[PDB]
Amino acid sequence: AFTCIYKGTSENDIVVEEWDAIARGIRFSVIALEDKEDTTNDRWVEALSRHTKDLLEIESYKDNWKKNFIAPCALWRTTHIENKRINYHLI
Amino acid sequence: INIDRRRKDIIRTININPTNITITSIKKTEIDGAFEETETEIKCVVRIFNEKTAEKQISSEKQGTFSSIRTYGMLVSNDVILEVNSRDSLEFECIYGRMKIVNIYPQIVKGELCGYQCSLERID
C-alpha cells in the first residue's frame, strides 16, 4: 500500500492541437519509499507512541513516516539527545 | 513584347474564369509613434489559381488557433493600383476561408504597368 499526497498542478493548462485535446497535470508525491518496518530501538519513542495511541485512538508511527500511513495519524521521532553524568552514580 | 499584347492576354485570362472580389485595404499610418488605421474597400474582377503545392500550417497557442496555406495565386488587371507592405494589407472574403494578398508582382512592360501577379494565403 501507499498514500499519495497532493502537491499541486502542472505549470499551465496546455492545449495540444494536433491531438485535439486539453490537458492538465496534477502533481502528487509519496513518502518514505524505503522504510518498510515501522519499528524503533528508541525506547522513548516507543513509549510516547504507545501513549499517544492509547490517549488519542489514532495510528502512531515511531521513527519515521511510512508510505502507507493512514490519516489521521501521529509521529514521534527523536531529534536530539544529550547525556550528562550529573553524579558518580547518576546519569 | 507590346503593352497591348500583355493587356489582351491578362484580360482574357481573367475572363476565362473570373471571380468578383471585394478587397478591403487597411493602411497603417504612423501617428505620434503609433499606428492609425484607415480602412478602405475596393472591388476587382480576379482569377484565382494554384501556384504552389504547399502544405497547410497550423499555429495554435493561447492567442488563438488559425491555419493558413500558401497554395493559391491570383491574377488581376491594371484597373486598380495595389500595394502591400509591412504596414499595409489586402484581404477579401472567399467562401472557403478568407484570402490574404501576401505579395504583389506588378507586370510591367517598358515601364507601363499592365496588371499584377499575386500570391495569397487562404486563412481558414
Nearest to B99 by CA among B76, B79, B72: B72
Q: What is the helix (H) or strand (E) element at residue B39, kind and residue range?
A: strand B34-50
β-strand partners of B43: B22
Burial of B73 (0-12, 13-18, 19+ CB in 10 A): middle
Q: Are B77 and B11 in contact (CB under 8 A)?
A: yes
Q: Which of B59, B62, B67, B124 to mutate to test the interface with A (most CBs of A within 10 A)?
A: B62
3-state SS record for A58-89: CEEECCCCCCCCCCCEEECCCCCCCCCCCCCC
3-state SS record for A3-48: CCEEEEECCCCEEECCCCEEECCEEEECCCCCCCCCCCCCHHHHHH
What is the spatial distance between Cα B34 and Cα B119, in angstroms, rounded to a whole number?
A: 28
Q: Nearest CA of chain A to the CA of B60: how many Å?
A: 6
Are A15 and B58 an interchain contact pair (Cβ–Cβ within 8 Å)? Answer: no
What is the spatial distance between Cα A17 and Cα A15, in angstroms, rounded to a whole number?
A: 6
Which three-class secondary structure state does DSSP give residue B94?
Answer: coil
Rg of chain A, C-alpha, whole Å = 22
β-strand partners of A14: A23
B63/A contact by beta carbon, under 8 A: no
Which three-class secondary structure state does DSSP give residue B104?
Answer: strand
**Per-residue cell: B76:** 488581376
What is the spatial distance between Cα A30 and Cα A44, in angstroms, rounded to a whole number?
A: 27
Q: Which of A11, A15, A22 to mutate to test the interface with B (most CBs of B within 10 A)?
A: A15
Q: Provide the phi-psi class of A77: left if phi over 0, else alpha when psi is between -120 and 50, else beta.
A: beta
What is the structure's resolution, reported in angstroms to one decimal?
3.3
Nearest to B38 by CA among B53, B28, B23, B49: B28
Q: Are A42 and A63 in contact (CB under 8 A)?
A: yes
Task: Give, rounded to a whole angstrom, the gap between the first and last alpha carbons of chain A.
Answer: 43
What is the spatial distance between Cα B66 and Cα B71, in angstroms, rounded to a whole number?
A: 16
Q: Nearest CA of chain A to the CA of B37: how many Å?
A: 33
Residues 6+ apart with CB under 8 A from B48: B19, B72, B73, B74, B75, B94, B99, B120
Q: Nearest CA of chain A to the CA of B103: how many Å?
A: 29
